Design a protein around this ligand. Structure first.
Ligand code: THP
Ligand code: CA
Length: 129
């Protein structure tokens, strides 16, 4: 896998974001995670977390996996990096997302993320409290 450029257009919520990629606006859905919707418990904290991480980043990058790059809604499916730190992993590590939607062939970072969730669960953080 490799990282490619993008620039933030607008924060949306925990596991979605509007980015410019190859000069086109697109909504990205983060691979392998599920954040609460804004209206749910920890929804507002998830959105805050990614909003800060995304907006404060100097360099946003996207990393597609080996499988489908867009979902049925036209959302890009990627790992998103803020100044080299994966947002997807950071959310899981903080107990603000669950590992989820693990589909065969788009699951390169599964075990990295599961290791983060186990550590979040141990710390009884957020969702796991
Ligand atoms: C994360 C991800 C979600 N999806 C689809 C499955 C779910 O379908 P349904 O909309 O039919 O439930 C939906 C969940 O996204 P959200 O958690 O953003 O709602 O997005 C994919 O198809 N591939 C993926 O890698
Ligand atoms: Ca969600």
């Amino acid at each position: 896998l490799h990282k490619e450029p993008a620039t933030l257009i607008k924060a949306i919520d925990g596991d979605t974001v509007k980015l410019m990629y190859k000069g086109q606006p697109m909504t990205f859905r983060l691979l392998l995670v599920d954040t609460p919707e804004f209206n749910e418990k920890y929804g507002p904290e998830a959105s805050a977390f990614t909003k800060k991480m995304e907006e404060n980043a100097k360099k946003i990058e996207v990393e597609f996996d080996k499988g489908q790059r867009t979902d049925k809604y036209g959302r890009g499916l990627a790992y998103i990096y803020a100044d080299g730190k994966m947002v997807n992993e950071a959310l899981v590590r903080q107990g603000l997302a669950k590992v989820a939607y693990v589909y065969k062939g788009n699951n390169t970072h599964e075990q990295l993320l599961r290791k983060a969730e186990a550590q979040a669960k141990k710390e009884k953080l957020n969702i796991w409290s």
